[PDB]
Design a protein around this ligand. Sequence first.
Ligand SMILES: [K+]
Ligand SMILES: [K+]
Lengths: 283, 282
Amino acid sequence: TSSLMEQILSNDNLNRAYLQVVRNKGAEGVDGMKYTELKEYLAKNGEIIKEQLRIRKYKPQPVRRVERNLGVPTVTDRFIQQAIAQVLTPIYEEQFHDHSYGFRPNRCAQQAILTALDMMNDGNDWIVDIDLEKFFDTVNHDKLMTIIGRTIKDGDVISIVRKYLVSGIMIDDEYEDSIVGTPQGGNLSPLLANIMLNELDKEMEKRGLNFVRYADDCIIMVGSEMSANRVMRNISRFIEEKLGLKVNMTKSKVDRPRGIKYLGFGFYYDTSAQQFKAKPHAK
Amino acid sequence: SSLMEQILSNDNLNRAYLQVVRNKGAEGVDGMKYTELKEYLAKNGEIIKEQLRIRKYKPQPVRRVERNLGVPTVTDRFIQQAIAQVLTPIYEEQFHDHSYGFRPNRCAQQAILTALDMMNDGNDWIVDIDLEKFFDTVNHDKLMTIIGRTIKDGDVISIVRKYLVSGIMIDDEYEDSIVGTPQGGNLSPLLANIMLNELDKEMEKRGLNFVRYADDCIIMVGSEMSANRVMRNISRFIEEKLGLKVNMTKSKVDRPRGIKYLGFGFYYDTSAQQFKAKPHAK
Ligand SMILES: [K+]
Ligand SMILES: [K+]
């Protein structure tokens, strides 16, 4: 991974990124450029942008704050972000935990719900529901880049990824309202969050915990109230002390499935089926 | 090494019994609880196996439960699961990538995502064909003939036909956006997918953009005239070639806002400038 920048800038990869970003549509960024204008802009500026990226002179624009609050990158920056993610995603898909489901290829929120239901119906129906503050509002950039740097050795890729953090990329959280569809502004930021939170997945696996995670939204299924309180404390301590993220103490809770709201779903006991099932909760 | 001996193998039966216990569920007509299956098979498994080998095993009728469900006895769920475990890998290689219902590693949300991608590519006239319940209308001989193209083991054909007669069908709680283990669906959804795969191949040959979840399919077309023509042609194929029943008053052509599919409604996100989906009011 010492020379990933030229893979990112290859003609095939950039053309795939352009196609995907146009397919994703979305609102315009701070430059007012519509997604239908990207093609003509890159015909004139694509080679200049490649040369700027090669010497770390490309300057991402700040995201446009759009009001749910969204940070929308310019369509040029979504294109570059997508080009970066197309190369890093296969690298990290080999590392990620099978119970991580958010913003990953061939995975979705319903899969996370099904796995959690299997866990609850096996007897692990004490739920540790840890609530985290917004990832990109709180993550330490140096800590994140150090974690990424364990795998990515290409300093040019490290450099532009850091610049996109400063630009304000963030996670579109409409999945919390059970919305299905293409997120806005999420070509790169959800991958970066998964890289950091993959350290949490590894810790929970090391502890033998049953969990599902969707971006920064995790639930842990344990067998007793005493064990649930112990896990709530230990994992909350780990997240704040080792990952430097922030736990919402009042919103985090231990409960039975009936009290959990997760990825827009609630849980209930089906007395005919004699097991827990899930359905969208009232909103 | 026949299909039936594969179904009755020790590894296959043990996996089937474990999965059926894991699936829990209500009792069938014999009153046997899922917690009683282990002891019953310890005592009677060899008799059951012998009866299956010589085509003398008799499935019990499903139990009507109330949304109406037909619940097989837990022994029959076990045998159905044992059959499905061998037939599923065979048919998984024949099935279409836009078939999502009751298949390993596939779910309703994936069908929604694929449909949304087709809609946002400009195919936002939706053909919404409504079929009467598959197992209330399918002709058993027609279904078994389609299955027989692949399954040549007469002992497997025999027991599958007997399960059709017993009344197996498809738990449709996914229509209410419910996520979880269906009741009574160890074998019936696979059989429905085997026949409806004939529709998938016909739609693929016609170059149509579609998604299907069991007997619930929507087709994404570029214009109103094209959508009505597809509705005409595909409804005719379903009735004439598959012998299924199309409900005229419920089979419509509409824009995404008028479609309810797998519990989801569709709307146009003006900020994102694209269609998205979310649970519809119920
Ligand atoms: K959570
Ligand atoms: K339909």
